[PDB]
Amino acid sequence: VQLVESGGRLVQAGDSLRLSCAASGRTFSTSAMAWFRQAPGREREFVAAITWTVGNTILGDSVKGRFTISRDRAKNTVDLQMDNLEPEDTAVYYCSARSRGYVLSVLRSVDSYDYWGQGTQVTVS
Amino acid sequence: GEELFTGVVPILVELDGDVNGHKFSVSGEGEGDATYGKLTLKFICTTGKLPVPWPTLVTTFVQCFSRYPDHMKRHDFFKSAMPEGYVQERTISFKDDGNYKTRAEVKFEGDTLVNRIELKGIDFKEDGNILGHKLEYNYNSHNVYITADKQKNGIKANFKIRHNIEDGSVQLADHYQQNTPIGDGPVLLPDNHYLSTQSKLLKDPNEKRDHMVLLEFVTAAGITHGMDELY
């Protein structure tokens, strides 16, 4: 499976930004997709996850109430809607996918995914 | 692992099928209660009329809900694979007619057990018992015979379904099955044993769509020196 993230740009504090990730290949097996981020100087951070069949979502503590995750099974895309952006949201945002089944709690771990994207750069002034 | 099946578990089923070029989709929903070996499921054909008889899809539409009594629990491959799940593959050969090839992934997505299936059928007779809709809406009880497959870290199963033909005898459907874990386990490789499987096909009197309601009870039982242990 190939994961391709897009949408990153330079925005101002208080702006909105939507990211999107496109999964290609043999995607039949997808069980969840997720967004992580890494700002240079800091460790990778869970941002959001979505369960593939039903669409249940979970968010990281840093982005609750500001970020929304959604997915389109026919298009094999997963989107991250970011509102009220702040300088501390500056990072490379990565898309990940899992095919193995799971209990919900493991979806917050960076080690719980089977596939990783290249990342898209978000900078917040 | 087994711990995930101690209560009532919601189930979702999705099938995309293509039989002789007749393409169709089915969505299913229900619940399983492995404590009682019990399944209750309802299936809707979302593309219109189902081009094959509902009974021919029963085995394709979650043996992790079988009741394994205490002395059998060492042999329950299906729950041992969870939550990461397993791949279930079958060839179903209809005597004197076509065959189905199915590949399904059975796994948890959080609290929900999901069975997602792709089915391709070929070589069917357009006026045979399947494409001609000549099978009775009912279902015989059967035993599913399970054996370990060490090299695949999984199991195989063999059994024959007897489908009643309207105003006729029986249409046999030869089932060959293989199950392999999706994750790295560990999993239980069982001794030879069988699943005693009881199915009832029902209709929802208020449902306008082409559909099937299914009630199943399944219990595992041992095999000793080639003889089925009896309850």
| CA–CA distance, A103 with A36 (Å, rounded to integer) | 19
Query: In Å, how far from its chain's centre is CA A8?
Result: 12
Contact A102, B109 (CB under 8 A): yes
**SS3 call for B174:** strand
Residues 6+ apart with CB under 8 A from A22: A3, A4, A6, A75, A76, A77
Neighbours of B196 (CB within 10 A): 19
Which of A52, A56, A71, A103 to mutate to probe the B interface, most B CBs <10 Å?
A103
Range of the domain at A34: 1-125
Contact A2, A55 (CB under 8 A): no
Q: Is residue B2 within a helix (H) or strand (E), and if so which, with residue range?
A: none
**SS3 call for B150:** helix
| CA–CA distance, A84 with A45 (Å, rounded to integer) | 18
Residues 6+ apart with CB under 8 A from B118: A28, B15, B16, B17, B102, B103, B104
Contact B172, B162 (CB under 8 A): yes
| CA–CA distance, B220 with B66 (Å, rounded to integer) | 7
One-letter identity of residue B227: M
**SS3 call for A9:** coil
One-letter identity of residue B90: R
Rounded to whole angstroms, the maximal C-alpha distance in chain A is: 39
Indicate the domain borders of chain B: 1-231
The angle formed by the CA atoms of residues A78, A84 and A87, to the nearest 5 degrees, is 100
Q: How many domains does chain A have?
A: 1
Q: How distant is the Cα of A39 from the closest Cα of chain B, in angstroms?
A: 29
Determination approach? X-ray
Sign of CA dihedral B69, B70, B71, B73: positive
Contacts of B114 in chain A (CB under 8 A): 31, 53, 101
Contact B218, B37 (CB under 8 A): yes
Contacts of A51 in chain B (CB under 8 A): 109-110
Report phi then psi at B195, rounded to 5.
-110, 120
Query: In Å, how far from its chain's centre is CA B182?
Result: 18
Which of A100, A106, A114 to mutate to probe the B interface, most B CBs <10 Å?
A100
Beta-sheet strands, E only, within chain B? 9-19, 22-33, 38-45, 86-94, 99-109, 112-122, 142-149, 154-164, 170-181, 193-202, 211-224, 227-228
C-alpha torsion B231→B30→B209→B61, nearest 10: -60
The pairing of beta strand B112-122 with beta strand B9-19? parallel
Residues 6+ apart with CB under 8 A from B21: none
